[PDB]
Amino acid sequence: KNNKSWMESEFRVYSSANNCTFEYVSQPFLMDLEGKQGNFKNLREFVF
Amino acid sequence: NATRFASVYAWNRKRISNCVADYSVLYNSASFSTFKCYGVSPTKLNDLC
User: Fold this and answer.
1) CB B27, CB B35: distance < 8 Å
2) What is the effect of changing residue 33 to F (chain B)?
3) How large is the C-alpha radius of gyration of chain B?
4) Cβ–Cβ below 8 Å for B18 and A21
5) Chain B within 8 Å of A18 (Cβ-Cβ)?
6) What SS3 class is residue B40?
7) Is residue B35 within 8 Å of residue B42, measured between CB atoms?
8) Cα torsion for A18, A24, A27, A29, to the nearest 10°?
């Protein structure tokens, strides 16, 4: 309701975490989840 | 620089990953009481890892 930003709030994927061997934080990116209409306006291509 | 450690059987292990440690001030500065090395010189830990 206040300051949307569409940021992640709760993490429901995994309940607990332990024995962490690695952690990293990448560069800040911009994401807007607001609903849109029409053809797909963006393309994201990742190779891991 | 920690204020209080744990017991000798309770010893805590600090996990250091994706970091850079300066070993020159830990040894060449001679700010501690004593140190002893095994298999590697204290001055060789800068170029080795």
Assistant:
1) yes
2) In strain: Omicron/BA.1, Omicron/BA.2, Omicron/BA.2.12.1, Omicron/BA.2.75, Omicron/BA.4, Omicron/BA.5, Omicron/BQ.1.1, Omicron/XBB.1.5, Omicron/EG.5.1
3) 13
4) no
5) no
6) coil
7) yes
8) -20
